């Protein structure tokens, strides 16, 4: 009787991963889960860690991949099929490249661009219908990889900015939840 918002943060698990760009989906989800109350406890029936509550006046399920980008997908789907969530009702918080720095919008369906964990999610789901918190993290250095580079962690310039990023993407977040998409990105989106 209450049919659900799924929030999930991408990264990598470890410790090795923690401080990445590829991690902000993580960092989002530990801010969101602060705010929520409780810790994150593992899904038995899915693997992924989970958090349940109320966020923005509504019922959330806040989650984690256990597994790694590359097959985040297979949690992911499980978990959005035991809560009968549709695709509509998701919503995935990523490090984007195709964005500046420190600059954050919201998008429904589109490419996934070059993050490999959207790629996962979508080729779970059966569909790219689904609403992304997309997180700057901008363009490479001249020549190095993106996916190398997503896998480094902050420049100390950037590190001191993180954590006010992060929040204001939580806050965008619930904003979604709260006002819906157009709404939430006409406060969040300008030139």
Same mark, same amino acid.
Not at 7 to 14: R, S
Not at 18 to 26: I, Q, V
Not at 139 to 168: C, H, M, Y
């Given at each position: ?29 530990? %801010? ?27 019922? %959330? ?14 949690? %992911? ?55 992304? %918190? ?58």
């Amino acid at each position: 009787m209450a049919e659900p918002l799924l929030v999930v943060g991408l990264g990598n698990p470890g410790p090795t991963y923690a401080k990445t760009r590829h991690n902000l989906g993580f960092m989002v989800a530990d %801010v969101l889960a602060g705010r929520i109350g409780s810790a994150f406890k593992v899904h038995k029936k899915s693997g992924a860690e989970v958090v349940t509550g109320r966020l923005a006046g509504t019922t %959330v399920v806040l989650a984690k991949p256990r597994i790694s980008m590359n097959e985040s997908g297979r949690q %992911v789907g499980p978990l959005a099929k035991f809560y009968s969530v549709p695709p509509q009702q998701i919503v995935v918080i990523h490090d984007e490249l195709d964005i500046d720095f420190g600059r954050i919008r919201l998008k429904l369906g589109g490419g996934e661009g070059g993050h490999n964990g959207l790629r996962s999610v979508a080729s779970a789901l059966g569909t790219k219908n689904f609403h992304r %918190v997309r997180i700057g993290v901008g363009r490479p250095p001249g020549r190095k990889d993106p996916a190398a580079f997503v896998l480094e962690n902050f420049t100390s310039a950037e590190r001191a900015e993180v954590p006010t990023i992060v929040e204001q993407a939580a806050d965008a977040t619930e904003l979604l939840i709260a006002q819906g998409l157009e709404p939430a990105q006409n406060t969040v989106h300008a030139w």
